[PDB]
Amino acid sequence: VYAWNRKRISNCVADYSVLYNSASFSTFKCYGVSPTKLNDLCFTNVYADS
Amino acid sequence: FVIRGDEVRQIAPGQTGKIADYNYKLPDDFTGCVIAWNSNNLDSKVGGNY
Amino acid sequence: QVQLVESGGGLVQAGGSLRLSCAASGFPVESENMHWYRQAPGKEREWVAAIYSTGGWTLYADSVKGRFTISRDNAKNTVYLQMNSLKPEDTAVYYCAVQVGYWYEGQGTQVTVS
Structure with missing residues (x-):
């Protein structure tokens, strides 16, 4: 949790x-x-913290 | 009806969830309330109750 | 008196085909949804199947995909269970549980694999 995996998605x-x-x-x-209603919305980038 | 432990939260107006969307949906302006009691001695049996 | 009688259990070789039967009298069977009850030495008792009202609607556990076939005698409220492609670890004792109120389960029957 203190070194959570970071991912960049687009x-x-x-x-x-x-x-x-x-x-x-x-x-x-x-x-x-x-x-x-999240399928029809999109942004510049997505950050994933695992 | 009968639900499970985590299903208690989903039985509420304005709360999202698969069961709250496909099984029992409460109105936004719902007036009234919910009484839930444990029935481990009535609805549960060895080997699985289905 | 509401009772259960068991029939069909016995020694069998892998890959057989037979009728398993639970015969009960004194109450209708389409009244509610019965289920079946299996016992093997281990952690706890392990489920197999159950069918429901308004159509067959047969449901099986993940380990029993497409093997048990059930033919069903509606005129005289009788079960017929039919086994296919048997492999060993399911040596067990069988019961059939129904609901008319009080909890009811009979004496069961023995099934072995050789």
């Missing part, structure tokens, strides 16, 4: 519907996006 197609409907995630808490 230049591709994001399908968050499968992630939302995966049902394998105990917590899916969104502060800054809605769980739905």
Whole structure:
């Protein structure tokens, strides 16, 4: 957690519907996006912290 | 009805979730409330209750 | 008196084909959703299958994909379970559990693999 993996994501197609409907995630808490209506929104870059 | 432990949070108005979207959706202006009690001695059995 | 009688269990070789049966009387079977109950030496008892009302709607566990076939006698409320492509580790004792109120389960039957 103190050396969390950092990933830079862009230049591709994001399908968050499968992630939302995966049902394998105990917590899916969104502060800054809605769980739905995220497919038609896109930005300059995406940062992933694992 | 009968739900599981993490399903308690999803049974609430304005709360997102797969079950809250496909099974039981509460209205935004819902008036009333929810009473949930443990039933480990009635709805649970050795070998699995399905 | 609501009772269970078991039939079909016994010694068998891998790859056989037979009828397994739980016969119960005194109540209708389409009343609710029954399930089946398997016992093998290990951690805890392990599930196999159950069918539901308003159509067959047969459901199997992940380890039993497409092997058990069930033919079902609606006129005289009888089960018929039919086994296919048997491999060893499922040596077990079988029960069939139904709901009419109180919790009910019979005596079961023995199944072995040689």
